[PDB]
Enzyme design. Structure first.
Site, mmCIF file in Angstrom:
data_model
loop_
_atom_site.group_PDB
_atom_site.id
_atom_site.type_symbol
_atom_site.label_atom_id
_atom_site.label_comp_id
_atom_site.label_asym_id
_atom_site.label_seq_id
_atom_site.Cartn_x
_atom_site.Cartn_y
_atom_site.Cartn_z
ATOM 1 N N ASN A 59 86.365 40.558 123.600
ATOM 2 C CA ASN A 59 86.670 41.476 124.689
ATOM 3 C C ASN A 59 87.101 40.564 125.812
ATOM 4 O OD1 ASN A 59 83.994 43.926 124.718
ATOM 5 N ND2 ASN A 59 86.118 44.037 124.050
ATOM 6 N N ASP A 70 86.265 46.412 114.503
ATOM 7 C CA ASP A 70 85.963 45.951 113.151
ATOM 8 C C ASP A 70 87.269 46.083 112.367
ATOM 9 O OD1 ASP A 70 83.283 45.869 114.045
ATOM 10 O OD2 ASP A 70 82.913 47.910 113.320
ATOM 11 N N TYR A 89 75.786 45.242 125.045
ATOM 12 C CA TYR A 89 75.255 46.144 123.940
ATOM 13 C C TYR A 89 74.093 45.497 123.186
ATOM 14 C CZ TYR A 89 80.232 47.857 122.829
ATOM 15 O OH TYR A 89 81.552 48.274 122.831
HETATM 16 C C1 LIG Z 1 76.281 49.742 119.844
HETATM 17 C C2 LIG Z 1 77.654 50.361 120.053
HETATM 18 C C3 LIG Z 1 77.974 51.687 119.308
HETATM 19 C C4 LIG Z 1 77.485 52.825 120.200
HETATM 20 O O1 LIG Z 1 78.594 53.650 120.429
HETATM 21 N N1 LIG Z 1 77.250 51.940 118.043
HETATM 22 C C5 LIG Z 1 77.312 51.242 116.861
HETATM 23 N N2 LIG Z 1 76.448 51.432 115.809
HETATM 24 C C6 LIG Z 1 76.533 50.722 114.636
HETATM 25 N N3 LIG Z 1 75.659 50.951 113.620
HETATM 26 C C7 LIG Z 1 74.942 49.915 112.867
HETATM 27 C C8 LIG Z 1 73.723 49.312 113.545
HETATM 28 C C9 LIG Z 1 72.644 50.134 113.974
HETATM 29 C C10 LIG Z 1 71.506 49.542 114.607
HETATM 30 C C11 LIG Z 1 71.452 48.132 114.802
HETATM 31 C C12 LIG Z 1 72.531 47.312 114.374
HETATM 32 C C13 LIG Z 1 73.662 47.901 113.746
HETATM 33 C C14 LIG Z 1 77.551 49.738 114.486
HETATM 34 N N4 LIG Z 1 77.924 48.857 113.462
HETATM 35 C C15 LIG Z 1 79.026 48.189 114.010
HETATM 36 N N5 LIG Z 1 79.296 48.648 115.282
HETATM 37 C C16 LIG Z 1 80.284 48.381 116.375
HETATM 38 C C17 LIG Z 1 80.152 46.960 116.914
HETATM 39 C C18 LIG Z 1 81.688 48.587 115.875
HETATM 40 C C19 LIG Z 1 78.398 49.578 115.554
HETATM 41 N N6 LIG Z 1 78.296 50.298 116.711
#
Ligand SMILES: CC[C@H](CO)Nc1nc(NCc2ccccc2)c2ncn(C(C)C)c2n1
Length: 309
Positions: free
Chosen positions: A147, A232, A124
């Site tokens: 994981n 989280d 990711y």
């Molecule tokens: C990237 C994986 C997920 C897509 O389904 N989207 C997402 N998006 C999130 N949004 C905040 C963000 C947006 C762009 C860059 C960094 C963080 C986010 N915050 C914590 N988490 C996860 C690890 C639980 C987040 N996950």
């Protein structure tokens, strides 16, 4: 207990990052201090999203702000998902200093890099954070919750069986963490693919006879869909529990995992109740009913079992 400094993302709507780790750590009564790494309208799994991100200097700024006031003394410290090599570096410096302020400062670190469906390669985050988590981050954390996929990128070793799992943890422990919990894995388990297995182990101490390690294995009941924010909420609840249960890696995961089934099948329950039987629940409908689990986050009605070793 008390003072948590959680550096994670924030979303106006929904539960991910600080939004998933705060309410919990709060009703279980911790004084949670939150540094929002980003502020997005919602997580990036929705079709659209808009927002800003915090760079490394901006993080620096907030931290200075706390030093100057001498209010920068924390017990446990929490971090999760990041995309920036540099933001993660800085975060490491900050966690260092806070351990001198408080010797019992446990850095709880969920090393979010990606996911697995069944044995592979990319994740990711850019691949360039991998080094930072391995060489810099993990050497200072005291509790990590990866994981199966991530545990493999860290140790660089592919997990094929259970005891191959246990020896990837040992290479983990030795890395630093007197606690490792593989939150999820591809490994079938003594109960069927209906389920999902996680692994746990804690390298402890007694003068000489210098060796103790503890292992366990929960198997919670898989759920038919794609939630975001589950890890989280996991790491958050671990901290709590592993707060009260300092030498009981056993006793912990047990209540945490338990709380997890409630939150999700209530989520899944309402989740479908919004298409009933007929179509797939949208990202919107899948968002955690963290509030409504007001009552369970609270009181884990201990629904899972685990085996030492
Ligand atoms: C990237 C994986 C997920 C897509 O389904 N989207 C997402 N998006 C999130 N949004 C905040 C963000 C947006 C762009 C860059 C960094 C963080 C986010 N915050 C914590 N988490 C996860 C690890 C639980 C987040 N996950």
């Amino acid at each position: 207990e008390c003072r948590v400094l959680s550096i994670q993302s924030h979303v106006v709507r929904g539960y991910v990052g600080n939004r998933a780790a705060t309410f919990p750590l709060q009703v279980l009564g911790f004084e949670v201090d939150a540094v929002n790494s980003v502020q997005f309208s919602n997580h990036t799994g929705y079709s659209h999203w808009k927002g800003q991100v915090l760079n490394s200097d901006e993080l620096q700024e907030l931290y200075d702000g706390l030093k100057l006031n001498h209010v920068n003394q924390y017990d446990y410290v929490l971090t999760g998902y990041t995309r920036d090599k540099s933001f993660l570096a800085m975060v490491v410096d900050i966690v260092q200093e806070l351990k001198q302020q408080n010797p019992r400062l446990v850095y709880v670190c969920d090393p979010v890099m990606g996911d697995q469906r069944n044995g592979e390669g990319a994740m990711y985050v850019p691949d360039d954070l991998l080094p930072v988590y391995r060489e810099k981050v993990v050497p200072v954390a005291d509790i990590i919750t990866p994981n199966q996929f991530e545990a493999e990128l860290l140790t660089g070793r592919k997990i094929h069986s259970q005891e191959e799992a246990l020896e990837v943890m040992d290479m983990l422990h030795s890395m630093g963490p007197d606690t490792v919990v593989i939150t999820s894995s591809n490994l079938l388990s003594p109960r069927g693919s209906d389920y999902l297995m996680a692994l746990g182990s804690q390298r402890t101490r007694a003068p000489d006879g210098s060796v103790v390690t503890q292992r366990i294995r929960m198997e919670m009941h898989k759920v038919d869909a794609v939630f975001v924010g589950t890890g989280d909420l996991f790491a958050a609840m671990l901290l709590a529990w592993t707060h009260k249960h300092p030498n009981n890696l056993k006793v912990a995961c047990e209540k945490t995992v338990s709380a997890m089934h409630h939150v999700l099948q209530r989520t899944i329950k309402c989740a479908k109740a919004k298409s009933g039987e007929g179509v797939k629940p949208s990202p919107a409908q899948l968002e955690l009913r963290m509030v409504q689990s007001k009552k369970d986050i609270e009181s884990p009605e201990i629904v899972v079992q685990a085996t030492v070793l």
